[PDB]
Design a protein around this ligand. Structure first.
Ligand SMILES: *[C@@H]1O[C@H](CO)[C@@H](O[C@@H]2O[C@H](CO)[C@@H](O[C@@H]3O[C@H](CO)[C@@H](O)[C@H](O)[C@@H]3O)[C@H](O)[C@H]2NC(C)=O)[C@H](O)[C@H]1NC(C)=O
Ligand SMILES: *[C@@H]1O[C@H](CO)[C@@H](O[C@@H]2O[C@H](CO)[C@@H](O)[C@H](O)[C@H]2NC(C)=O)[C@H](O)[C@H]1NC(C)=O
Ligand SMILES: *[C@@H]1O[C@H](CO)[C@@H](O[C@@H]2O[C@H](CO)[C@@H](O)[C@H](O)[C@H]2NC(C)=O)[C@H](O)[C@H]1NC(C)=O
Ligand SMILES: *[C@@H]1O[C@H](CO)[C@@H](O[C@@H]2O[C@H](CO)[C@@H](O)[C@H](O)[C@H]2NC(C)=O)[C@H](O)[C@H]1NC(C)=O
Ligand SMILES: *[C@@H]1O[C@H](CO)[C@@H](O[C@@H]2O[C@H](CO)[C@@H](O)[C@H](O)[C@H]2NC(C)=O)[C@H](O)[C@H]1NC(C)=O
Lengths: 39, 1043, 50
């Protein structure tokens, strides 16, 4: 099970959620076709 | 404990079945293996398990009492009544005389039961299961007679309406039976009876419900009967039996108290049953006024004697069996640890029946019989059954009628009545042997009269068994039926052939009319989107939905595996699943709303410049994506259409996936993709399709390389890379499924103009009416069904606008209006119009061909044959030879240039489509699987587009674009692998038809015109419809059952 | 019933398992061995009593 692993990182998960919401970060990679070269 | 024994279902409802009249009726009426087995096992457990210790203690006590009395046993005391030192040996010889009759009857009934219940539950060389026949103890097989009638054409002489029509009382039958008694100078009947006995159901008070006893008041002056009354012939026979018992009671009044029982203990039943034999015969009924005339026919005699032999012969192993087991128990040969063992050994050895379930020493199966707990000897019934035919033969020989023994009543037989009275006078005063000798002529029991009575039916049974060729009985013991999955909750599923057939016919007849009304409403709506036909369409949709739900719930009560048919089983299985009616009402309404929203949003969305002049998908965006050779305009159209349609349907798709998956789960499957794949009835469809795609990969790769080179030569090297995928918007199609529009860019030999002539000169004529007439003319010339004239008198096809605002489709509609099939499509002036016309003509011919099949079996095998049939003839129509014929081009040549140009056009039509057809459903199957989630709907779609088709996005496609939504078939829940299967199948069909029609040489120049053998083989494989699986039609068309 | 022995395979009337015993074809009574087995112990007990 992953319950122990999730409970290990619970403070960090909460802090990361708070910071991402504050910064307006969107989870995931919506522009999946992006590439640094960009031709 | 025997009396208050009950069995009830695992649901633990407030009621529990009792032996009478619940369990007996269930075992005599229900032809369900699971329900019969549940009743049998439950009753035997309930009435036997709590009785074992009581019976052991009773056996000990009774043996002690009768050993103190002087007899060695209780069984010896029971045998002492018959007064014979060798009683068991005479009984054994008697049964060994009657064994072949029961063996033939057992084989016949076992064959009939095998035809009924199949081969899984019944062995043609083993014993019959002990619950599938007649009673619970299998003592009498009368209730089996329904399914084992020798000649079912004639009506069985078991009628109650004739009694009611003549105005028979509820008590006058006793009077006419009394006058029948008095006819043979008998019945010195006391006047106390009618004024001191009741023969009627209890009108008031809670007395006994019903029984078959005649309690006598005794007192040497008065007697009585307590028995119900009915209007059946069985009631009349039982009345005659009971009055025979009363007559026996009368004739020994003068004898002392202990000398009241009549000779042998079986003499009572023998005297009661000889008269019943002499009464139930049809000729007595005719001459008494209960029948119009005698049916002096062999078949009626056989039917009557087989009905009589189902109770008077099937009981012979019983009685003998029961008292043999009880004698063994009393003797100590059967200890309490061997009750069930010896019981079932005797049951299989004599009766030839095996327990439906596994039994063991916990059970006491002999205790479910009534006479074991209520301690009454049972050999009296065997003795009486043997004796009654001896008495019948003696009276008949003494009645002066030496003919067949069946129609041999003793009515108006003075001497027979005198002999009967003379025997009846002495009850136990003299040994029974002297009485039997005085009446019959010999002092011992004889089985010869019983054989003589059943001689014609015996000969018939032996002859029929020899013709059917079966073993006489149980050469394969140790066989027990497999459990029917008797974990007791699936016992109420009806598995009857008659009920299934009746349901199938009712479903057919109601479905025909309801589906015709729905088809008419759909035709009215689509032909004219104005005049508010949407309301009628919605009404017909509601009618279809509720009808489908009702009949699917009705068919869910049936079964599939236990059905002993092919067509009925197929229909029941195909009706048991509700495509969308399995959802609850709220979810069903939500699903309908989601589907309608997706379809309307796709059909309405348009993209265009901010100038103001605006374009729709068809025929504006398609035209600007077909005839425009420019990166900017093609990219604008592609991006705009994808934007509009896909971003509109993205907000709807995930909920649609959820709802369709829920419906498929409720229907039995695990996914909507699994439900769609089940249309082909192949458990390994994906592997076969992947194998076919791998087989066809090299040809597509070569064509892709050539088209890529041509596009690079035209557009340049900035937009096209020689190594790398080609952008999806440069192939002359919105979805790049077919690359036919860029043929002028990819012409192999420009100096071979033998295909541009068609559309160049079609302006000279070629009306839609005349071209469809030519198409059906070719259809008929092939050797197929001509089109009914209503297609021209009633139906229309030329509907460019026709006062409606719906984009053009290429569909075919069918309805069982006797003979009516009509189509709709937008008609242009080009060769593709003729190709699609032939495709729709093939659709309509497929509609015609399976006309006589049931409505549920109106499908064309798997839904890939339906599309393949029209394209098969379209392939032969488009050949240059068939274009030169019927004047579709100026001139044709077999040179390499024209042939290569024609093949390139056909390739850009079909090969370019192979990957797309496989890709659409491949993505959709992974979406329904849960493998593709909402976050990467687009990413996996474009991964598939690059992997299979080899195309690249012209612009960066982000998440939230939903490119797959721009395809029409995706926001319409229309499966798409059918086009892959059809494109694979049609070339096999073309090759097989050419081979049957000859045309040795290249396949692409073969023409199916004037091929009677090919047409007849196509018809003989198309007439199957959906009745048989598609490999059979594949085998008939081609010769191999594989794609 | 007597020996508490079940066949290892499914048997039926095509077979004749009583013939696999030696004494059945070469017809020789077999109850003499039962009688002798009982009688030898009867004799042993009586002799040791005397
Ligand atoms: C067994 O016992 C019964 C009961 O006692 C005997 O029945 C009775 O028989 C006597 C004569 O033995 C009857 O009496 C006679 O009846 C008529 C009346 O009209 C008449 O003939 C004489 O005046 C005389 O009274 C009697 O009615 C009859 N029943 C009773 C209830 O007593 C029976 O005979 C005995 N059976 C044998 C085989 O001995
Ligand atoms: C039996 O049915 C008849 C039908 O009428 C009832 O009365 C009989 O009537 C006939 C004609 O008048 C008389 O001759 C009979 O004596 C009557 N009795 C009979 C046949 O028993 C009679 O009441 C009915 N009996 C019932 C219903 O118990
Ligand atoms: C019903 O038909 C059978 C024959 O199917 C009749 O049997 C007759 O039996 C007598 C016995 O003495 C023979 O002599 C006759 O030749 C038989 N008749 C034939 C063969 O036609 C029987 O009598 C018929 N019963 C009735 C009531 O009609
Ligand atoms: C069992 O299958 C047989 C064989 O198909 C069925 O007989 C046909 O049933 C179809 C049902 O649509 C009818 O159209 C045919 O006319 C039947 N053939 C005849 C009557 O020869 C049969 O109905 C099925 N059911 C039973 C109970 O036998
Ligand atoms: C009697 O027992 C045999 C042995 O199990 C049964 O099986 C078949 O026996 C025949 C020869 O009698 C062999 O050729 C077959 O290979 C056996 N097996 C099968 C599956 O057929 C045999 O069926 C039994 N006989 C009867 C009459 O039931």
């Amino acid at each position: 099970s992953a319950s122990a692993m999730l409970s290990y990182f619970k403070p960090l998960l909460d802090w990361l959620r708070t910071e991402n919401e504050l910064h307006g970060e969107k989870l995931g990679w919506p522009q999946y076709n992006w590439t640094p070269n960009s031709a | 404990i025997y009396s208050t024994a009950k069995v009830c279902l695992p649901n633990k409802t407030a009621t529990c079945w009792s032996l009478d009249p619940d369990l007996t009726n269930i075992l005599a009426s229900s032809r369900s293996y699971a329900m019969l087995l549940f009743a049998w096992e439950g009753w035997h457990n309930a009435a036997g398990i709590p009785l074992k210790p009581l019976y052991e203690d009773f056996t000990a006590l009774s043996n002690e009492a009768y050993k103190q009395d002087g007899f060695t046993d209780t069984g010896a005391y029971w045998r002492s009544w018959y007064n014979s030192p060798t009683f068991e040996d005479d009984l054994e010889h008697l049964y060994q005389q009657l064994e072949p009759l029961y063996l033939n009857l057992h084989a016949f009934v076992r064959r009939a039961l095998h035809r009924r219940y199949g081969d899984r539950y019944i062995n043609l060389r083993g014993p019959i299961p002990a619950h599938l026949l007649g009673d619970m103890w299998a003592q009498s097989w009368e209730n089996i007679y329904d399914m084992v009638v020798p000649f079912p054409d004639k009506p069985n002489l078991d009628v109650t309406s004739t009694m009611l029509q003549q105005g028979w009382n509820a008590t006058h039958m006793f009077r006419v039976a009394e006058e029948f008694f008095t006819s043979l100078e008998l019945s010195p009947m006391p006047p106390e009876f009618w004024e001191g006995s009741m023969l009627e159901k209890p009108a008031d008070g809670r007395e006994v419900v019903c029984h078959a006893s005649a309690w006598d008041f005794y007192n040497r002056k008065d007697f009585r009967i307590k028995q119900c009354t009915r209007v059946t012939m069985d009631q009349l026979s039982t009345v005659h039996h009971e009055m025979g018992h009363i007559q026996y009671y009368l004739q020994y009044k003068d004898l002392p108290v202990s000398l009241r029982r009549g000779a042998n203990p079986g003499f009572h039943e023998a005297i009661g049953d000889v008269l019943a034999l002499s009464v139930s015969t049809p000729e007595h009924l005719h001459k008494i006024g209960l029948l119009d005339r005698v049916t002096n026919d062999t078949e009626s005699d056989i039917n009557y004697l087989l009905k009589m032999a189902l109770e008077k012969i099937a009981f012979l192993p019983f009685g003998y069996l029961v008292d043999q087991w009880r004698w063994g128990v009393f003797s100590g040969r059967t200890p309490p640890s061997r009750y069930n063992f010896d019981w079932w050994y005797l049951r299989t050895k004599y009766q030839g029946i095996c327990p439906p379930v596994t039994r063991n020493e916990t059970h006491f199966d002999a205790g479910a019989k009534f006479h074991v707990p209520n301690v009454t000897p049972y050999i009296r019934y065997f003795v009486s059954f043997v004796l009654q035919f001896q008495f019948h033969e003696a009276l008949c020989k003494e009645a002066g009628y030496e003919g067949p023994l069946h129609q041999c009543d003793i009515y108006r037989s003075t001497k027979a009545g005198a002999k009967l009275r003379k025997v009846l006078q002495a009850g136990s005063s003299r040994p029974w042997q002297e009485v039997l000798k005085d009446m019959v002529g010999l002092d011992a029991l004889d089985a010869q009269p019983l054989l003589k009575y059943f001689q014609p039916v015996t000969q018939w049974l032996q002859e029929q068994n020899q013709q059917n060729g079966e073993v006489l009985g149980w050469p394969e013991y140790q066989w027990h039926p497999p459990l029917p999955d008797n974990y007791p909750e699936g016992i109420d599923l009806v598995t009857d052939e008659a009920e299934a057939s009746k349901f199938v016919e009712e479903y057919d007849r109601t479905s025909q009319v309801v589906w015709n009304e729905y088809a008419e409403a759909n035709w009215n709506y689509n032909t004219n989107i104005t005049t508010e036909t949407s309301k009628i369409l919605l009404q017909k949709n509601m009618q279809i939905a509720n009808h489908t739900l009702k009949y699917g719930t009705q068919a869910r009560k049936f079964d599939v595996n236990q059905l002993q048919n092919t067509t009925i089983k197929r229909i029941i299985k195909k009706v048991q699943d509700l495509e969308r009616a399995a959802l609850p009402a709220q979810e069903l309404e939500e699903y309908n709303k989601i589907l309608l929203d997706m379809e309307t949003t796709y059909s309405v969305a348009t993209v265009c410049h901010p100038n103001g002049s605006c374009l729709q998908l068809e025929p504006d965006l398609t035209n600007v994506m077909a005839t425009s050779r420019k990166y900017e305009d093609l990219l604008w159209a592609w991006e705009g259409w994808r934007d509009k349609a896909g971003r509109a349907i993205l907000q709807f798709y995930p909920k649609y996936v959820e709802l369709i998956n829920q419906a498929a789960r409720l229907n039995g499957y695990v996914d909507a993709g699994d439900s769609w794949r089940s249309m082909y009835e192949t458990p390994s469809l994906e592997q076969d399709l992947e194998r076919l795609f791998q087989e066809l990969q090299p040809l597509y790769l070569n064509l892709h390389a050539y088209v890529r080179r041509a596009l690079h030569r035209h557009y340049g090297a900035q937009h096209i890379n020689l190594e790398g995928p080609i952008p999806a918007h440069l192939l002359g199609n919105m979805w790049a499924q077919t690359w036919s529009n860029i043929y002028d860019l990819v012409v192999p030999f420009p100096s071979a103009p033998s295909m541009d002539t068609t559309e160049a000169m079609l302006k000279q004529g070629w009306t839609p009416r005349r071209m469809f007439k030519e198409a059906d003319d070719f259809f008929t010339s092939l050797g197929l069904l001509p089109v009914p004239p209503e297609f021209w008198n009633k139906s229309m096809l030329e509907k460019p606008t026709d006062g409606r605002e719906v984009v053009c489709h290429a569909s075919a509609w069918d309805f069982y209006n006797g003979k009516d099939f009509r189509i709709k499509q937008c008609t242009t002036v080009n060769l593709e119009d003729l190709v699609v016309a032939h495709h729709e003509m093939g659709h309509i011919q497929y509609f015609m061909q399976y006309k006589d099949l049931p409505v549920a079996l109106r499908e064309g095998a798997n839904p890939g044959f339906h599309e393949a049939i029209g394209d098969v003839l379209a392939l032969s129509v488009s050949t240059p030879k068939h274009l030169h014929s019927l004047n579709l081009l100026s001139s044709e040549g077999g040179s390499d240039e024209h042939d290569i140009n024609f093949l390139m056009k056909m390739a850009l039509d079909k090969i370019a489509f192979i990957p797309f057809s496989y890709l659409v459903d491949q993505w959709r199957w992974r979406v329904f699987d849960g493998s593709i989630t909402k976050e990467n709907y687009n990413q996996e779609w474009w991964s598939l587009r690059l992997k299979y088709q080899g195309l690249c996005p012209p612009v960066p496609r982000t998440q939230g674009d939903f490119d797959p939504g721009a395809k029409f078939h995706i926001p319409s829940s229309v499966p798409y692998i059918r086009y892959f299967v059809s494109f694979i199948i049609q070339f096999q069909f073309h090759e097989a038809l050419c081979q049957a029609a000859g045309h040795t040489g290249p396949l692409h120049k073969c023409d199916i015109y004037q091929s009677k053998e090919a047409g007849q083989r196509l018809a003989t494989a198309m007439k199957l419809g959906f009745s048989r699986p598609w490999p059979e039609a594949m085998q008939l068309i081609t010769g191999q059952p594989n794609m």
